[PDB]
Ligand binder design. Structure first.
Ligand SMILES: *Cc1cc2c(cc1C)nc1c(=O)[nH]c(=O)nc-1n2C[C@H](O)[C@H](O)[C@H](O)COP(=O)(O)OP(=O)(O)OC[C@H]1O[C@@H](n2cnc3c(N)ncnc32)[C@H](O)[C@@H]1O
Ligand SMILES: *Cc1cc2c(cc1C)nc1c(=O)[nH]c(=O)nc-1n2C[C@H](O)[C@H](O)[C@H](O)COP(=O)(O)OP(=O)(O)OC[C@H]1O[C@@H](n2cnc3c(N)ncnc32)[C@H](O)[C@@H]1O
Lengths: 573, 573, 104, 52
């Protein structure tokens, strides 16, 4: 018996834990995944010296914990086999494919992570706020009151994640890119550093935030928190919540310990589901919400008929660029260079503090010393200079999120020929209109690897504004990126596979009125009709958004926990 | 001050810890890497439910912790850049390349892992013994005595790693492949299961051994070992051992804590280096053994002139096959099949226990039930049937090691069209003659990512028998694999990049006499001349070997620890 | 639909086609060798403006075909090499090889 | 195919790509020598590589 049980140990489940453990509730948390980020439980995997030394190897870490949600049956012909090799006469269901999945209505890049800390053990840590256009309402008919509520929630979410905009302020590359863009879009768009959930520890080490930053996941009471109560139970599959008859309360949570094989029911006052946008939906379906099997509006579900409908995923366009000659030469614009590099006469000098210099002294010292000490190196940028982290945030005249940066990436052998200091990544994210016909549903015949109902998508990007804006966004990336450099071969402007972005929203969406707003939870993230059932995560977000959603989802989790504190009493310790 | 200090927390360093902590020595162990395998410190990363469900994702784990030792300067031309993009006029030293490295004398696949548990957190766990031809001598001029010593050491090493040959005995695929090969090579070669360091826990879960199996790496004393003494210090770079003047003793170990930045000297009675074949050599060079800079026999080193010479790496050939029609049909040879699958009349039956059946009842029940219950599936092999794990061990008439199995592999989209149950991997490993001219040396100008002397190879596969045998081995794989099926397109028989095998040996090689056997350590793994310095690992192996070397290296570590117990007294507790 | 946009290249003295005095081609004639880079300044800026223009214009018709994303082609693949024996009015003042009758 | 079959490259630089998955029995040079019709006068970084 617990006061509060939380399904899922990602950053949203950890927000509930931080708030509710700190308030004195006796809290249990279950995760189907295991502890495997080191002794700091749920911490960011990128915070080892070895990954900080070799960022690009990190793409392997990410890929190794992303499992595809729904893979269609493969129909590719292989006809260069030996005649002795056994072959079927049809393209049969094999290799883990979902036979319910129409390949032409899929989110083929959608994937899930089952580990303690969830996806926050590998995420990019970008934590922008949503502007009004992207953001669900918390106060109706009073925009100033609505803004005030969001500001308070986002401010607390930013403190939990240690969001900052200063960790890259003395990078030459960052400031090179940022300066050019600020100048090019003067009077039209504003640029800043991407808000990142991270703390710089040294000039070459950044401690990336994670679920662990929000809540350390250590069992309590302990010497450090002797009056708190928390237990974490990894390798436990939460299967089903038991509804009462009137669908007004949850009575227990059915769990399956994957190590012992034992199956139990756990009792709690408050049940919080934070298993992610796919797996929250799965657990609800398995508990008798919505409908199992292929959707059939002939007869909509009685319980939460909007569950799994109005799903949204962002469009994502990508390229990389190789920095222009104009910009590289500008790095060293304040220098007087004489002689020929490597020969007796070579020198590089500048006049500190001169009013006509284009750069600050900190920049010019770094450049000068790099050029003088490394004459074998033809670039003016220090070897260990951090990467750009630049954005122009979503606005009505440019309704997409932008990241102009470097993230872990697997470079091919041709691309490895280009010096890394030249390369900048461009990721532009579009907003997707929520449409009733875009669904996540669960098979009544096929099961997934954990023997739960197999998720299946029926998705297409909506016609109309979403689609038009996706193309305007592609064009905008092409236009903007040209100010910095030309494209890197092999990383020409392209759309990525749908869902590869991992910002799936709207699967258990929020609104004011269940019927009128076609939604599953109210603004306290409480499931309609249920006194003690709360859902957290991006699945709650009912709007068309382009920015990265986790901070927003954390903010809605905070509000949800304020409701729980107003309505449920902790047990005596 | 410690009785014993161990540099490196892989399985060889853990062998020293297990032996010496258990004998009552006060032991410290340092690893440059971090704890990141979960709460069981140094455990196998593949032992999560999630990897057991999705083996192929594990290749990402491996790749994410393999860092290339020496990468030459890239000279590939990219000429489809935009004219605005900055480009150098030469192929300059960039992107981490080693300018000392001749691309045509490299081991381009050689890589290192810096993590607590070392490479044993991702290894394949194959632990064969070496036969006399491959194995260094421990007793001169008495082959029976020599065999007896190796048998005792291997038996203890097998118990430490939990080596077994029974974990795949009821797999249909394993027995299908094994049976065919046993029959095809009757009277010529013997086949068995690959000896694997692993314990089966259920029909779908195998607990793969690791450094943690050998020693749990927990600090001691603790409730469970209240009279033992052990401390593990991760994120500590060991830089140098301090020699006395006479080169008869080590006086201290210089360390650098990578988190605090502090640099200390640690005192011990016994110093053991188990940092791997590359990094042991690096640490010795940094400590004044051998020679820094490009080798120059004009003046050989005074101290350990054979260090870093006579290096050996195995040749490795690879393919995959798609199982033959003959073999797939043989699975169901005992069945009477009537009707058409999916139709009312379909049935599959057999006669249990009949003397004319080709398979045991356990096999036929599995097949029959699979065929009847899954009529949409055209194959007779159960979905969760384990993979083959088959070998014919090195012999003078086939002087290569063989693994005929499945390991984690990244399948392309065409290859994903072939049902996984059809696919078998073939890895054949050749032996490489030790030659003086094959060297690992360390730059006196360029440093690696941890600011230690940059490793550089001067390697080519020797002419003569090694090379001839590499081709005979390629032919043998082609011949043998054809008995099982034809090649899988994209996985046609091929040599892999040199060093990708990761069985680098001979860098600090063992023998009886330093001069006459051109070696660095004696048969107690004691560095010649030094009373208290021991090296462990594959670097000790002085022979041409084809089998996987870790069990052999563990065996030599055991012998080394028996010497330490005979010669050094533990401190009072 | 295919989109091919072709830019103009400023003639620069330093961009040369020359012929080896040591190496011969397949017909045993002096081997052609280039010393070429796209000029700095307007040519190069316009090449990027042109890339942008193709991206903008093409979006009015449809999205890109995977595998045929906007890209520069290898230099010279266009086969519109000019200026190797160039025309002008005055040999010296116009740095040229033939007059307006194409007479050397 | 018709086009490609009658376009002959004007000036091809010396190839320096490393192939290191050959068999140990196969003959290999220790340098990237002038071969396969390459023009040793041609700096790969000042070429018109598509000219034909
Ligand atoms: C993968 C990734 C994600 C990502 C990112 C880059 C990549 C490569 N970049 C981001 C960024 O720059 N900014 C941002 O806002 N988000 C970014 N993301 C996405 C972000 O990681 C996710 O939005 C976030 O982690 C979602 O948090 P939430 O806590 O809701 O969910 P989760 O992390 O997926 O964790 C859920 C857990 O629940 C478990 N689980 C699942 N099913 C069950 C059942 N049945 N029973 C018990 N536990 C369950 C999982 O194992 C998991 O840990
Ligand atoms: C990677 C791998 C290896 C492998 C394998 C498959 C792959 C993909 N398959 C194997 C198999 O089937 N059978 C077998 O016998 N071996 C197989 N291997 C190789 C095996 O993992 C290695 O032979 C073995 O792990 C070697 O053990 P050893 O203990 O000698 O070395 P290590 O595991 O590399 O660990 C050494 C550690 O030392 C640290 N270190 C390095 N430098 C320093 C310094 N300067 N200071 C402090 N510590 C240092 C490392 O961080 C490391 O953990």
């Amino acid at each position: 018996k617990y006061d509060v049980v939380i399904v899922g140990s990602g950053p949203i489940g950890c927000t509930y834990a931080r708030e509710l453990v700190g308030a004195g509730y006796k809290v249990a948390m279950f995760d189907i995944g295991e502890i495997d980020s080191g002794l700091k439980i749920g911490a960011h995997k990128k915070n080892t010296v070895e990954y900080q030394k070799n960022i690009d190897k990190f793409v392997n870490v990410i890929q190794g914990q992303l499992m595809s949600v729904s893979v269609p049956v493969n129909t590719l012909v292989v006809d260069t086999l030996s005649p002795t090799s056994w072959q079927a006469s049809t393209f049969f269901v094999r290799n883990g494919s979902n036979p319910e999945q129409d390949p032409l209505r899929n989110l083929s890049g959608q994937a899930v992570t089952r580990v303690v800390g969830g996806m926050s053990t590998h995420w990019t840590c970008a934590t922008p706020r949503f502007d009004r256009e992207q953001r669900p309402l918390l106060v109706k008919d009073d925009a100033d009151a609505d803004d005030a509520e969001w500001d308070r929630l986002y401010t607390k979410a930013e403190s939990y994640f240690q969001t900052g905009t200063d960790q890259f302020k003395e990078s030459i590359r960052h400031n090179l890119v940022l300066n050019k863009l600020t100048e090019e879009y003067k009077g039209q768009r504003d640029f800043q550093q991407i808000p990142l959930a991270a703390t710089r520890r040294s000039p070459t080490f950044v401690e990336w935030s994670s679920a662990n930053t929000v809540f350390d996941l250590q069992n309590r009471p302990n010497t450090d928190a002797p009056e708190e109560r928390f237990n974490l139970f990894p390798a436990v599959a939460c299967e089903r919540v038991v509804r009462n008859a009137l669908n007004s309360e949850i009575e227990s949570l059915h769990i399956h310990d994957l190590i012992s094989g034992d199956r139990f029911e756990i009792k709690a006052d408050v049940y919080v589901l934070t298993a992610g946008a796919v797996h929250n939906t799965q657990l609800l379906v398995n508990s008798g919400f919505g409908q199992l099997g292929r959707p059939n509006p002939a007869n909509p579900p009685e319980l939460l008929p909007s569950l799994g409908s109005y799903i949204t995923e962002q469009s994502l366009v990508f390229c990389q660029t190789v920095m222009s000659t104009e910009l590289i030469d500008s790095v060293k614009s304040d220098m007087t260079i004489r002689g020929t590099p490597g020969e007796l006469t070579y020198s590089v000098t500048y006049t500190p503090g001169a009013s006509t210099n284009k750069h600050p002294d900190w920049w010019n010292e770094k450049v000068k010393n790099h050029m003088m000490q490394h004459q074998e190196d033809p670039l003016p940028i220090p070897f260990e200079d951090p990467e750009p982290q630049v954005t122009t945030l979503f606005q009505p005249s440019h309704p997409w999120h932008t990241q102009i940066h470097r993230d872990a990436f697997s470079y091919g052998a041709v691309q490895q020929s280009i010096d890394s200091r030249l390369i900048v990544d461009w990721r532009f994210f579009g907003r997707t209109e929520p449409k009733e016909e875009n669904k996540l549903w669960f098979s009544d015949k096929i099961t997934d690897a954990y023997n739960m109902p197999q998720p299946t998508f029926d998705f297409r990007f909506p016609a109309g504004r979403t689609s038009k804006e996706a193309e305007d966004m592609m064009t905008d990336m092409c236009v903007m990126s040209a100010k910095i450099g030309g494209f890197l071969p092999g990383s020409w402007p392209q759309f990525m596979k749908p869902g590869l972005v991992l910002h799936l929203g709207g699967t258990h969406r929020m609104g004011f009125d269940e019927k009128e707003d076609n939604c599953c939870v109210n603004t306290d993230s409480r499931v309609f009709g249920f006194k003690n059932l709360f859902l957290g995560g991006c699945g709650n977000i009912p709007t068309a958004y382009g920015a990265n959603p986790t901070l927003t989802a954390m903010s809605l989790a905070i509000k949800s926990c304020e409701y729980i504190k107003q309505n449920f009493t902790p047990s005596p310790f």
